[model samples]
Target chain A: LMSLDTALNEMLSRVTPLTAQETLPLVQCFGRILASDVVSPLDVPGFDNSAMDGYAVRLADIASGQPLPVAGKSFAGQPYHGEWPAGTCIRIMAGAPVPEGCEAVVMQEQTEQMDNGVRFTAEVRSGQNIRRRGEDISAGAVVFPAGTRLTTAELPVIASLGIAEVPVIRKVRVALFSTGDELQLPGQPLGDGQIYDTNRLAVHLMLEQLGCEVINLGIIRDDPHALRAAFIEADSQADVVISSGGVSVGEADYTKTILEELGEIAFWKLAIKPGKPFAFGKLSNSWFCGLPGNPVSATLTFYQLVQPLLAKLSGNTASGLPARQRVRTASRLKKTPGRLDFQRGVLQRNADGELEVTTTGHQGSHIFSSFSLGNCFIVLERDRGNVEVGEWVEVEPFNALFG
Target chain B: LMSLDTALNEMLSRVTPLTAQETLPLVQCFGRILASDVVSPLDVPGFDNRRRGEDISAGAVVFPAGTRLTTAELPVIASLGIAEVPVIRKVRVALFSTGDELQLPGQPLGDGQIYDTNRLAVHLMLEQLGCEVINLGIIRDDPHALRAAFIEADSQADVVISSGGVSVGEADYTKTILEELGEIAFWKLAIKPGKPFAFGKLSNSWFCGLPGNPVSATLTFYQLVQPLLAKLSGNTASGLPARQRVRTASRLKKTPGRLDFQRGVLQRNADGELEVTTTGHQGSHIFSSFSLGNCFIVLERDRGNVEVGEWVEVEPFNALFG
Candidate 1:
């Protein structure tokens, strides 16, 4: 059995980032992978502006002790343009450009507004409440490098730079299908020894959230001609083709024989719980991944391995995996040491407001409730044993799928 | 002046949960709020002789009502062979950004103008929250135009949101127009980067008036409007996570009045204990704090500037930011 890390690393190293690119309007670029380095065309803030709703003044003008008469006002969307009196102040609101000669702005709370003028009650500094131009971003600066995935955290910043559109990697075309004799579509009466085709729905939803254009080919039965035709069609239309089931050793699985003629596929028995059997390699024109027949195992392998592979193929620089954190367990965890375990666990702040995790009952590959009930995976190492209360353990939080 | 807690309580209490619903295919229910509890129609068989009832039995309350269906939940439903699910109707939100200084991207920047960031941010967020948005575009700060925009928005949406005009700026007719249209409260929330906030009701829709500053508008919307949208959409789960107490690895600048939500990076330090550091210069205009940081270093309302090594409360951004 291969280690999960080694298998993932080898898989990642074998793939190539997509080179195709498209220019999309900034608003439409959400969730798209950036394809080029974005350089700032202009400085942020454009000009020096007030950071407070107050009076802009020179240091020398404020020492007269008497209230300085207001010369003019500067509002946001409006700037002061005329010459200013040497010993007077200008009324200014936040986002308004500071008059050319003004040194600082005194907030309204620190000034006493009176008929005489605006009284300066606070000490003056050379640069106070004045947001300098280009402080946050400078012209010709690299704002974001190629391969950054745009999301809520990224899109608005790009918008702020006044960039109308962005260059992003083209959406990945993924062809998906599931194969098995005992598989039946949901909403249909199950045959004796048949189960609902849950993996297709699960993988499709995940692909959609990851910004893939999914081509679902429905369910291919246990017939050789049908399987070959489905494979050919999927490979022709997609950058990657994914099928759930028939990767593990099975008497009814003709998947191995089909791949022998049409592709170079490797069936891997990974040293991981729930998801042990996985297949990866290349078809004539596309990449291929075969997941386990069990629903939970298929979901696990897709999230842990295929997600990163897809990220790489789409030119996304993100690791596609969240950082793992170590915390104490509130409940005892049962584990077998032969394979790495991804047991479903609920992570939350306990009564004392410290992070802790508890198990979601049964932890078997065939059991399905864990995915629905828990928010994270309690990742116990291959050699780790039963975890007792207060014993430290590692946890990886669920991605947007669980979100 | 309302405390953040007080303001949130008053706002949350005054609102009512939505009751409208529709039946959609289980596969199409992603992100939609569940209007009814999902009880297993048939047992999920574990081992056999293929027993009909095993891991989950028939008629068991698998998932409660008012839950938002997610990638995790939908497959479980599919596994049970459920073809359709009852879900709450998508929330309708009318959004616009206000400011003469604000210009839509793809246009030449006029004197003292900027690309409007708040509306795009809010629109994207609203969509992620499973909303049907009626974008009203950018509304000029003029009183008549602003008033007309509100009336149009109210008639078509369940919620009306406009950025800018909540502050006490003299040029803003938001207060005046809001007073004429519905019951509104201008709240100075005790929170930094987010002070001036307006919430109330229009003739036909609930309204939220966001601040003009980009950072403030985004934060206020995330901290306040997000929960309200969840409530109005009939989702019963709390969208925000509980704040975890962690030590700071950097000196944090904070005032003693408002609760400060300074963006910070949360990490498990070398000692395996979680620690946080600031994203630097928490100016209200530095919108990059969000992109640079993963969590909010939540300082208490009465707290002052924090030194390194002091314990502080931190909140990780939930799926909404994903």
Candidate 2:
């Protein structure tokens, strides 16, 4: 059995980013990985601009009670083109280009308007609100580095630079399916020993959130021939193939035999609770990740193991791993040592604004409702025993997929 | 000026869930709001054959009513060979940008012309909220143009959102058109960056007019319009977005009258204490600040200045950023 950390490291080591790149318009490039460093073609502000809706003036002009005559007004897109006299000031809105000789800007709230000019009621300092050209970013500077995943925030940055298109890595295609003879689709009459397939849908959502294009292969039965054909088809079509169930040591497990026959498959019994039967390998043109049959186990394993792998394959260098935060447990936790326990828990801030967490009822892998109610995983060390109330623990909040 | 909290409450109170409903396939309903409570037709994973490591003989019920069908619930439905699942129709939003200075990206900028970033930013924001956005493009600053756009939006969409022309400027006809078409409230919110915002209703469609500045528009959309849209879309499960409290790693300049949302980067220190710092310039015109930060350091209306090492509330940019 492999430790969770060791398994993750090994899995990540075998994966590499996709090599292909494509040009996409900025609006459509959200959630895609930048293929290379995005160099700014022009300065961020492009020119010096006002930082506030105030009066642009020289520091020496505003005296105790003197009012500076209004030379002109500059709106956001409009800049004052005429020359400004020594003591005169120009009214400016935010983002308007600063005039050549403007030394400072006093906010309109700090000034009182007189008959023909604005009177300064507050002290004016040099360089008070003048945003210098190229202050935030300079031309030819790397705004976004290679392998940077573009989010909604980053989109505006790129767009503000006037760059209409961006170079991004091609979206990773993932072939997904579930295998089990007793698994029945929803809306169908269940047999005596059958259950509706939940793992595939959950995994599909997870993959979609990761920005992967999912090629759902539906459900494959527990027959050797059917499993072989599905495996072949998935390998030929997608960059990676993911399936749930048939990895455990069950009499009806034909996935293991077929996988081993087609290519190399390392069936790992990870030292992790809720999920133990995990598999990773490579078929002809694709990588493979097999999760457990249990619903909670499948979701947990996907978040812990497959998520990072998929991120790497999709060319994301930053933020591939789940971020962990420390919080105090609101209630006691039960545990027995050998395997690392990932119990579902609800994380919330108490009335006093302190971060605290409590378990979401049953910790069993069979309880799908508990997983639904949870916002994070209360991670316990493998060698640790039962937890007492108020102990600090590490938590991995569910990403946008489940959250 | 209205307090941020008070304004938010007023805006939210005026919104009610739309009664109209439509069915959509599950794949196409990724971010759409549910119109009605979705009751599970049968038990999830209906057949209970395996109990832990042992095989069970009978089936048991699981998963209750009003549960939204996420990707987690799709496989079970797919396994049943249900090709199409019923979902609420997306809320159609008619988006218009009102400003003569606004120019579409990829166009040469004439004198007094700027790229229309507010429209793009607002479009993505509405998309993130699961609204079917009908981008009406940039409408010229004229009463006839404004009226034409508003009438079209009112006829086609459930909501109308226009950026710019809501402020007290001479080239503003959006307010007049809105007033002529419906009851509109012009609010001067006590919030930094985002102050001038308007909300009203136009014959069968709700209208929200955001600030003209990029940062102000984004923040107002997130803080004010987002909650109202969520409620109006019948999403009762996930309430207002959650905020977390953390210690500030640097000094934050704030005034007492208005609530300020300063862009910030959050980091867990070596001691496991969460600390945050501002992302460069806090100017409203700086879009780089928005891109650089992951969360917003929320300062209250009464709170003056924040010294280093003081606790401040922060909201992660998950829904919008992702």
Candidate 3:
């Protein structure tokens, strides 16, 4: 049995990001991964501006006990362009460019407006309330590096830079299908031994959440020729091909010849609970990831394995997984020694203010409700035993798909 | 001056959730809010010729009411073979930016105008929250334009959000216009960077008036508009995660009076304990705070500057921050 890390490393090391890029409008580029670094063409503030709404004055000029007449008014969209004489203040609103030779800005609340001009009541300091050019970011600065995915946090900043569009990697095309003798689409009548085909819908949703272009081929039949046709067509069109329940031990004979015909495919018994049977390899024109037959196992494997693969294929540099945090257990958890356990658990802050993890109950592979009730996975090592109350363990928060 | 709790309670207390509901196809229900609890009519077999209750029994409540559909929840519903699921109508938001100093991106800056960052930020956030946006573009600071914008927004949207003209600046006409259209309280919230805010009702729609500053507008939208949107969309789930106490690894500077939601990077340190570090400046002018930080380092209203290794409340950003 292969360890989970080794499996991930092996798969990650085998594939390279697709060499394709496309430039998209800024609004349309949300959720797309950046193909190249975005360098700023100009300074962030562009010019010296007032950070407060009041009077822009020279610090030394304001020290004298006199009411300086207002030279001119500067609005945000309109700057004060008139000449500034000595001992005169420019009335500037917030975000307005400072007049030439103006040093500091005294807020309106601190100033007294007299008949002569505005009187500075508070002590003034040099360069106070002034945002100098390039304070936040300088021109030619690499704002965002390659492999960054565009999100709300990054897009608005880009817009602030006057960048109307950006170069982004093309979306990963994933061809997906599920196959089983007893598999049936939801809303269809179920016979004995027949269950709903849920893995396809789950995978499709996950793919959509990851911003991938999914080519859902629906549910394939149990015959070898049907799967062969599906695999050939899927491989020709997609960057990656995924099938649920097609790599099970019982269906090996049906897929063995066709899978071998395309390329080398390894059937991996990963050292992980729930999702033991998995497959990862290369087809003629695309990579392949085969999920387990069980719904929970399929969801777990797709989340753990396929997620990162898609990220890497899409040129994303960051790990697709969220960081794991160590927390104490609030309830006893059952575990075996052979495989790493990703037991669904609810992580929360107790009354004592310490984070604790509690089991979601029923560790059965068919218990799909476990995921709905839990927000994080209690990750126990392969050699670890049952955890007692208050045992320290690692907890991983769910990604956006579950949210 | 109003406290954050007081302002939030007052705004949330008077508003009731939308009761209108509709039934949607199972596959199309992803990202929609649930109006009723979903129950399975048949038990799930253990891949078995098994008994009825071998796995999940019939009449089992699969999901409770007010559950927002997501990748995780939709699969469970699909697995149960339910063809259609009842869900609430998607919240329609009429969004616009108001300011003479604001300019749209792709256009050159006119003297001192900053690009209209709030509109795009709010639009992207609304999409992530599964709310439909009726973008009204940029409304000028003129009173007639502001009034017309409000009336048009209220006519078709469940909520109307306008950024700018909420602060006490002389050019603001939103307060006066809203008074003509409906009832509204122009509030000065006890929160740093996002002090200026307005929340009330128009003739036919709820209203939220954000500050003109880009950072303040985004923060107020995330903190206040996010939860309000969840309620209006019939979602009962909490929009934000629970706040956890963690030690600050960096010296965080703050003044007493208002609660400060400082952006900070939260991570498990070398000591294996979760600690938070400030992302440089906390001013609303620094949009890099969100880009550099993963969580909000929530400082109490009366808390002053924090020394390194002091406990602070931290809340991870929701999906909208993405």
Candidate 4:
């Protein structure tokens, strides 16, 4: 009977950001938030160096046709012992410090060379080729600030900044479970009216996407005693516990009854189709999100509601998920919406840049195959329904589903 | 000296893509390639069921807008022993079957009920969600055909896929080194300079931009290496390598040698404004690049000739052991 907004607001109100924190190594900091800032200890290039293999010289000493005698040689890591004498040049390779009173460097290409003598054939000027000291970076500079998300490119930069390791938040730890007598693990043989359990696999990857350390607690049968024990045991080892099934009003539903006995329900039965029978509560130290038994419903609830909650709990920046829009449907949609509908639909952009959407064959919650071909979830608002052809609709692209 | 492209091509010829493969679980196959196609045995929505708490019908009793008396109740589970009676009209839940004629069942939703009950909402909708769901294991499908998938998903997907007791190649196992001491491959050190070694902890992130050119590689090292060395060595592992010392072996240069490194130019001497001199060839990379053993001749060569007083670039790329 409650609107989706009211349901979500009530659920979010009970939750607050967690205060736990831990430091992690730099290599393990990828995608992790920084706890503090990093500063450079010294200038990048510590010395004035040469830019090229060409000559470094003062341009004042050049004639149209004259030969300059060969002089002393200087190389990198081997600077000249003393300053060069006036009217005399010094041989140098790249990276060697410039000698005092250097005029200009002349290339060998524009001159004529006789066995022991070299003659210049072009006019050259002073300061033609010289690299000033501290050209790249001066000492004492701030590289990056605090609260930054370390990315791939940032890794190499951090290493270059002379900061070996960094302090980052530890990965979030999550535990998952599924309940139902009709549910069986993937590798098991199916019984009559039984389905291979896949909810755990979906939850596992969703946690991985958030960079959480997921704990797979397997399946829970339709027994109040066993469910009660599992809750107590799971909370001891996990920061968060996610479950699917047993939250609805079906005779098989025991989760709500048990939750009331051990934990408190934030809210359930939202004004959202395909995902109304949801549960958000906490049992002792573990946070519980009871997704609807329908596989699509479970997946959507996890993304729409649980994702934001997890972000806040992990101390990550809170932001709304991106919303996508698609063109009017080519096929008719039947609905008298009392609750918001996330219709399974295929979205395509035509050659003319116009987007189009069409529902997959089935819209039922248990039909998992329909999602395999669905590119977008055409979002229909509550109180509106029965869409005719050629009506633009809002869509949520599938990153979590396909990814 | 040859150009930068020439040097890059020379180094690239010596390297190739790495050789290795890993197999992961089916659930981990997202973003990974599919080694084989997965076929579905039953149509999605395995059976036809009602969406509301109602009944099924037969004959003329199946009329539109008629809320007939409760004749059949289809529970989600067959264990509930709920059945649908013929001749009763239940609102069509507006569903369809995909793949084959294996009709998938729909669960009825009360005004307070949920839609697409269980597998129906997730699996049936995956196809429309732009994801490829390999419905490998389905009811009434050939068992022998499914067994072969263990090999197919392995070679096909960038990350191999396997389930159950996988073959050796399909298992992801980390290498366990010998518990006993053994001979090592090699060891090395850090030397030659950049930032001064210091203990300055600033709560800020830093960045370093290295030049794209080979000549800049030397500049980047001098500007970036020492500080990095200090920061990394500051941890538990403290004893770091010390920078080596070198002295000029020869004298009388046309151009002074700058601190930055240069590639391609040979060491030579000439006269002009300063003492050091420049060599003829000057390029990013050239076959004539010989080892510089701590000693170098600064060349201030004109466009083509050696000049006096100008500093030239120099670097060490080989061993200077006595």
Candidate 5:
């Protein structure tokens, strides 16, 4: 068995950047990694104008108590015509252009005015209230460079930059299947020794979340010919294909032999719990990720091992969910060292601002109940695994891992 | 003119916590606050089973090295009578559980196993990797109990607690409008008379990096209400709403009857130099923000007046867009 780091690094190294291609307008680019840089076509705020509603006047015009005459009025849409007369002020609303010949603006509250003129009780600062042009952003500036993912915030910038449409990386196409004669789709009646083919649904939701256009290959039996057909069908439609079950040492597990005949097996075993018999390789233009038969094990292996590989293939510089600090262990953990373990755990903050974690019952990969309630992963490293209560263990938050 | 703080407090004081009568499911609870505590119904792992494929006698079951044993098999599913097992060890696999799991069940890999699992990785974490989820919905949790209450983090609790309404703090049912309907003004025509809204599609692929510029100013407006409005209206209407043309102005501005607002300004005149107007108040929620509206004010100096009730064209905040 290989160390977890060795397995991960080896897998990541095998992934090459995907070829670039164009996508349509208003297309959902949620999970697609950017391939190139983005430059703004125009200035964020292309021109200059007024900052507020006040009198625009030259500095030489007003005195400490002089009543300045209101020469004209300028609204936002409506601007005062011609330059302002020397020594006269214009009543301008906010967002309206400052009339010509006006050096400064005096706010209405600072002065007392009758119908004829305005009287200032105090002196006003020159350029006291002004918004400089290009204050927010300037033209030709690189607003966003290449390799950035599209987000809600980024969408608005595209608009302000005077861009009506955007170029984005094409989403990766994927095809998936869950095999097993005993497996039934959810909401269907279960027969003896039969269970819901939940892996299909789980994998589908995951692919959709990542912005992949999925071509579901559907469930099949253990027949090698049927499996080959499924693979061929998926390959024709998607860039990647995935299969779960029959990868372990069971006699029924013909995945390894078939892989040798059809494609190269990149890696078959990992030094990680719930993900030991992981398989990765290439089949023509499509990549293959064969997960363990156990549902939870399959899910964990995908997130921990395959997630980074997918990111690398999609041109992402980094992958893997972020790690957070946990205050203490809520329950004692028992384990030995050869392989790394990602135990399901709940993370919470204590009154002391420390993050505490507690493992849920049953450490089997097949248990989904614990996975549902769990918000963090208690990573027991490969070299060392024994854990006691109160130890500060690294916890991967649910937010980082999933959402 | 009221200070930014004073204005904010005044408008905010009217907001109250929403009651728990309506229960929104977890799917609809993205931004909503959780009102009550939620407890776990059962131990996360419903059962425990063997961890190794290898079998052995009691004395031979040593740590490390494989646990060697007989050819006889003890399937993990046996004790449970082929029932669903707990997701103790999180598995990683394809995203769409519906299709991928169906294609490869107990089958040999033959170029068909490369179905993308990225989305499943994300969903796996969210759905707790197939664990039963006990979502109690969202609720508003306020510390002050009587301020302009808005939702924030920390409202999530572990258990679902029940409570009868107290007379002192009984939730009032008025013709309440969703916060999205609040009269937040768009820079229709660029009120400050600077440059009008610059519209365009992204020229580059880096949408996330550059997207900030579009709604960057509006973010300060507090929440992407416009987008929400667009989405909601789109659901009901046949077409998109008309875009309002607006411009910025040179100095301070205010509305006599309408909610007054002004902030820092931007733009340049014919000479090709830059110009701006500063707002006196920088409070995010100040309804009559432009009282002494002078732009360019900072956090510390967010108060003061322009002159008096003058109409000042200002830039909108950018908080809402994120």
Candidate 6:
């Protein structure tokens, strides 16, 4: 059986970043991966400016007991271009350009208003409270490197450089569906031995969060012709195609046979609990990832296997794996040795201010409620056994999925 | 100087959740707050189905009210063939940046003009919160421009957010116009990097004015306005903005008057303990610090300098941080 990391690495190695790129306005570029480096065209501040609402004065002019005469006032957008004389200061607002020859600025609160000028209560140091022209960012510097994913916080940095549009890799398009005879859409009356198709919707949202444009094909009936047509259509439309339920080792599962007839596919038996049967390969024009049929298994395999593969194909530089953190267990954990376990758990800081986790009831893959109630997965190693109540464990907290 | 908690409480007290509701397809309701309780109309999975690996039969389950539908629950609903779900009407926000020094990106800069960073920052934050944001663009410091923006926003949006002109300066006309147009309260919050924050109600929309400083504007929006907006949007989760406790990995300098939300990077030490350190600079004008950190090292109102290895509370960056 393949290890989880080895399986993921192998899958990612077979994937390639999309070659398409487009220019989008800065406002729309959030969450998109940059296709190339973004170099600043101008300094961030553009020029030297005040870091506070205070008096911009010559450092040598301020004596312990004497006051400095007010020369002028410089507000933001209205710069004082005149030269500064000795023994004088100019009142300035925050973000206002600091006039030439001004050495430092004393905050308004640190100075007292007197009859003729402002009295400095504290000692003034040279070049204090003055933000330099290129302090935050220098002109021609690479602000964001290639393959960098833009976030809300990073968007402002691009805007500050006065760049209106950004070059970003196009969003990955994913065609998703579920295949099972007993599956039915929500809002319909369920027949005996039938269940609502949960994996399709769950996987759709996950793909959306990963910045993929999902083409939800809904539920495909368990017919070979219908499955073949859906697969062909999905492959033609999207860069990647994903399906759940039909890839498992069930006698009724025809997805595997169709996939093998259509393309070069690898059916992987990973050493991971809840999720073991995973299919990965190439179609006519799309990368295919077949998740397990169980709800929990489908979700876990998507997170552990498909997420990174899609991310690599989407041109994202960061590893697509969910961030793992270490925490102490609040209760005993049961696990077998051969397969890695991703048990649903609630992670929180206890009253003692220490990070601890407790299981969310049953760990079965069919127990969908356990996932709804969980904030993270208590990831036990493949060769690890039962954990004591106080043992340390690794956790992968759910990000956008739960939030 | 009002305490940060007190100011937030008062701001939340004056606001009320909107009663309007709308129905949207389940696929379109990812981040929306539920208008009412979403009790399962039928049992999830509905019938006795085969469990993977084991032969155990599946039973019915119920999801209660006030539950936010995420990707996890949508599939189950889709399986039920419920195509549409009722949700609260998205809160429409009119966002504008104030001050003559602010210039839109891709425009020629005048003397001392800075590109409008706050608007893009605030717009993305609102988008993350699932609000329908109507960006009114950059409004000058003139009272008439302010009034016109206010009237238009009140007529169309549920909330109006402006990022500048709330501080003590010549742009005090913002406060004047807000007072003339509707009930408003300008506050000096007891919080570092963010002090001069304002909140009020314009004719039909709530008004929140953040500080002009980049760090202050973003932090105030996250700490104070985020919760208020979440409450007004009818989110019932008491722990709206989640926080966690961790140890400080380095010494921190803080004054005793106001709560400080210093940007910090969180990491696990070799011993498997969570520890945090300041990103770099804590100045309110530094935008890079906001980008470099993953969480905010929250210090109490009366706390002074913190020693290394001291336990402190930190709030991890959520959608707002992005």
Each candidate: RMSD to true structure? 2.5, 3.4, 2.5, 24.8, 18.5, 3.1
lDDT for each residue of candidate 4 in A168-284, tens digit (9 for 90 to 100)? 656667888877888775445567878666556666767776768887777877788988888888888877888856444323346667777777755566777677777777888
**Model 3: reference contacts kept, as a fraction:** 0.78
Lowest summed-lDDT stretch of 10 residues in model 3 chain A?
A245-254
Please give each candidate's TM-score: 0.94, 0.91, 0.94, 0.49, 0.57, 0.93
lDDT for each residue of candidate 3 in A146-206, tens digit (9 for 90 to 100): 9897888899899899887899999999999988778887778787878888888888888
Candidate 5 chain B, poorest ten consecutive residues by summed lDDT: B204-213
lDDT of 2 by residue, A321-394 (tens): 56688899998899889999999889998989888999988788755666567888888989988989989898
Residues A122-224, candidate 5: write the lDDT tens digits. Answer: 5777665554445545666666555555543354344334353456667778888878887765335556667556555555556655556778777877788
Return the lDDT, model 2, position A310: 79
lDDT of 2 at A61: 66
When summed lDDT is taken over every stretch of 10 residues in candidate 6 chain A, the lowest stretch is A245-254
* A1 Cα displacement, candidate 4 (Å): 5.7
> How many steric clashes does model 1 contain?
0
- Candidate 6 lDDT over B1-322, as tens digits, reads 8788788788888888876888888878787766655545554334435523232223433444446778666665565467777777788888887777787777888766778887888898888788889998877777788788889889988788886654422346666777788777778878888788778777788888887777788888888878887877876667745678888888899899888988898877888777899888787776877668888888887999999988898888885554
- Over the full model, what C-alpha lDDT does candidate 1 score relative to the true structure? 0.84
Residue-level lDDT for B317 in candidate 4: 28
TM-scores of chain B, in order: 0.93, 0.88, 0.93, 0.20, 0.22, 0.90
Q: Give model 6's TM-score versus the native structure.
A: 0.93
Let me know the DockQ for model 6. Answer: 0.62
| Segments in model 2 whose C-alpha atoms lie over 4 Å from true places | A58-68, A85-87, A103-126, A247-254, B24-66, B71-85, B166-171
lDDT of 5 by residue, B1-322 (tens): 2233343343333323223333432222222222332222222122224532222222231112111100000121121222221111211111111112112212332221211121221222223212122222222232223112111111221111111110111223200211121222112221211111211111110000001111122322222222222221112212212111112333333433223334454333344322445544443312123222223222123323344323333332321111
Chain A only: TM-score per candidate: 0.93, 0.90, 0.93, 0.71, 0.83, 0.91
Using DockQ as the measure, which candidate wins? 1
Interface RMSD of each: 1.9, 3.2, 1.9, 30.5, 22.0, 2.5
Candidate 3, B60-104: lDDT as tens digits? 887888887777788888877887888888899999887776777
Candidate order by DockQ, highest to lowest?
A: 1, 3, 6, 2, 5, 4
